[PDB]
From a paper:
Aerolysin is a β-pore-forming toxin produced by most Aeromonas bacteria, which has attracted large attention in the field of nanopore sensing due to its narrow and charged pore lumen. Pore-forming toxins (PFTs) are important virulence factors of many pathogenic bacteria, which are secreted in a soluble form and upon host membrane binding, they oligomerize into transmembrane pores undergoing a complex structural reorganization. Four distinct constriction rings, two at each end of the pore, were identified from the structures and confirmed by MD simulation.
We obtained near-atomic resolution (2.2 Å) cryo-EM maps of WT aerolysin solubilized in either amphipols or SMALP, as well as in LMNG-CHS (2.6 Å). The overall Cα root-mean-square deviation (RMSD) between the structures in amphipol and SMALP is 0.82 Å for the overall structures and 0.74 Å for the extended β-barrels region (i.e., residues 215–285). Interestingly, this interaction network can differ between the WT pore in amphipol and in the nanodisc. In amphipol, K242 interacts with S256, while E254 interacts with K244; in the SMALP structure, K242 forms a salt-bridge with E254. These subtle differences in the interaction partners between the two structures suggest that the residues can switch between interaction partners on the same or neighboring protomer, thereby enhancing the stability of the barrel and establishing a robust geometry of the pore lumen.
Numbering used by the authors:
A (entry chain F): 1 to 422
B (entry chain E): 210 to 418
C (entry chain G): 106 to 209
D (entry chain B): 419 to 422
């Protein structure tokens, strides 16, 4: 009937069916929809009362729901909270190059380093912080690594603790820019290392008494690559008989007769890629006149500057081992395994990388396949998790100025000349 | 009525292709040979052979095609006829040209780096031979862009070719600024030249009276 | 799939009328009662709760009702989509050109 | 046609 969020459930040991004020008993179907969550918050031989004279039982009884009565009651608020992750106002980065904007994003202590470190901590990643503090997310080193950024606790001096040297690393990469449509601008396009592919010059002659538009000159250039792989398997069988005779004239003759059979099976897989560039000129020629035309195709390196205003999204990877005491992975491993998980901070891409999808679907146990967010709510409280996730998913807006450059692209030129009277 | 629905099209295509194939095979064969006395034919030698083979082949290829098409689509007045002609030639083509342009270029430095101190980020001390190319002009890539490296010197992880902080320390900020400003000064010129190319296409499309 | 009166009951009764055996859980004797709903892959499974014990021949082989392959017949004027965003952009090809008109 |  209505979705039930396990974090809002509460047990009242006030007698058979007597909940607290602002709370009502949970019925059988609601309990069944979230059975694993409720059985997880019960004693092994505990028996609790549902509504309508039903009862749920602990892990010792396999969480059975059956008619009965008890002294403790499972209750849900009369007006529950939705628990949605709030949306915060956009953080504005001062304008610059892409790398400069990334630099300013990943060196923001209050808006980036702290919320992401706290998210890694709440999920159960061990040693999120440097050796010169005890607080989570302090004494963090930020480094530029290839095309990404790494934020890791400063592992200087010495540390006390089990495997205190295996600091959790936070990786930021795969930046994307949702542009404001009216803000994009580009500068001069410049060409270098121009190598001629092909040119054509022509005349379009109109001897009629009316303007003629029916002319076409077209130059097309195509390049393709292809590949193939073939596996063949064969079998053969052969039988030979050899005999000796005295043929009349030739004398002693050796006769061989051979019969063979063969079978073969071949399997082939291949592919190709093609790129084509076409240029056409179709002049309108005045009556009793002729027009010259020219088409040229070059290969050239192309460059131009550009700028825009954009929302900024990125991939956030968490690497480290999960704490033995408690972590939020749905299987809850206990051997301190190494773990890497990537979230997409930005528009939805898939379920495994989307915090919002998992957070919204936490009321369906069959959908809980990566992170157990109900567990984090139980450990730290709903408001704390909401605030941390709201800060982690805060939109970012920036002005970007950059340079496009590419090698061996196409450069075309199509010219319609001035008419010459006939 | 006047009619515009006519089309004559002449198209000419040329193509080249290439391919390379590598094949590897294995074979296994077992033969048995025996002697019998078959009734009528007498002494007979019988051979029985069984073979199996396996093969793997890998091919890579490519092609290039160039096509030139010319069409004529005359509008013909009512109760009339128009002759049309299309010609395609191969020809060498030439023409003079002129324009006004900004001028950019590649600047390569070749030599050995000083033992006392050099600006390469690794700071080699064995006097190695060194060639490095800068693009004086619009940006092409990080390794050839002085402006990009200069702007990014505040990020140690981006410092992968030249250590401009070292040059600033050795010579002063203003000196390096002025020298790089003079090195990257834009250049403008008027150019007059000649285009020439062999074995190009020449077309002629004619709508008559 | 959690609507008892509009989905679980009519579908359970249809299974019972066609002759499927044991349409219901172990804690009732009525058809379509004490049914568990679970999310399985991209579908849903509704099956009688097989807890405790049962009296009957093969009473543990409860009939399962599977719901999958959802489709949506859209009202034509009601579709709307938001901003299209692109990620992991890899260039394939580009061409720049000029179109010159020297005629009048 | 269907209006948008």
């Amino acid at each position: 009937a209505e979705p039930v969020y396990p974090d809002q459930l509460r047990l009242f040991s006030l007698g058979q069916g007597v909940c607290g004020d602002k709370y009502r008993p949970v019925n059988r179907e609601e309990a069944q929809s979230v059975k694993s969550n409720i059985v997880g918050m019960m004693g092994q031989w505990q028996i609790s009362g549902l509504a309508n004279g039903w009862v749920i039982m602990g892990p010792g009884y396999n969480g059975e729901i059956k008619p009965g009565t008890a002294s403790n009651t499972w209750c849900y608020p009369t007006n529950p909270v939705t628990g949605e992750i709030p949306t915060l106002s956009a953080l504005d980065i001062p304008d610059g190059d892409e790398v400069d904007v990334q630099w300013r994003l990943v060196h923001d202590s209050a808006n980036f380093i702290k919320p992401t470190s706290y998210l890694a901590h709440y999920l159960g990643y061990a040693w999120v912080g440097g050796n010169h503090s005890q607080y989570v997310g302090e004494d963090m080193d930020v480094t530029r690594d290839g095309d990404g950024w790494v934020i890791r606790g400063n592992n200087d001096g010495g540390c006390d603790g089990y495997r205190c040297g295996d600091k959790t690393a936070i990786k930021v990469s795969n930046f994307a820019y949702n542009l404001d449509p009216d803000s994009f601008k580009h500068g001069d396009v410049t060409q270098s290392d121009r190598q001629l592919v092909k040119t054509v010059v022509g005349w379009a002659v109109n001897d009629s008494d009316t303007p003629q538009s029916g002319y076409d000159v077209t130059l097309r250039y195509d390049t393709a690559t292809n590949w193939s792989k073939t596996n063949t398997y064969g079998l053969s069988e052969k039988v030979t008989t050899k005999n000796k005779f005295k043929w009349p004239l030739v004398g002693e003759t050796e006769l061989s007769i051979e019969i063979a059979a063969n079978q073969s099976w071949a399997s082939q897989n291949g592919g190709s890629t093609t790129t084509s560039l076409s240029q056409s000129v179709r002049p309108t020629v005045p009556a009793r006149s002729k027009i010259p035309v020219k088409i040229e195709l070059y290969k050239a390196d192309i460059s131009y500057p550009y700028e825009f205003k954009a929302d900024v999204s990125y991939d956030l990877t968490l690497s480290g081992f999960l704490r033995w005491g408690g972590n939020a992975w749905y299987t809850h491993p206990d051997n301190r395994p190494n773990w890497n998980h990537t979230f997409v901070i930005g528009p939805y891409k898939d379920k495994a990388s989307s915090i919002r999808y998992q957070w919204d679907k936490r009321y369906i146990p069959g959908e809980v396949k990566w992170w157990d967010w109900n567990w984090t709510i139980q450990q730290n409280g709903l408001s704390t998790m909401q605030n941390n996730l709201a800060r982690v998913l805060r939109p970012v807006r920036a002005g970007i100025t950059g340079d496009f450059s590419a090698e061996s692209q196409f450069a075309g030129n199509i010219e319609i000349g001035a008419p010459v009277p006939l």
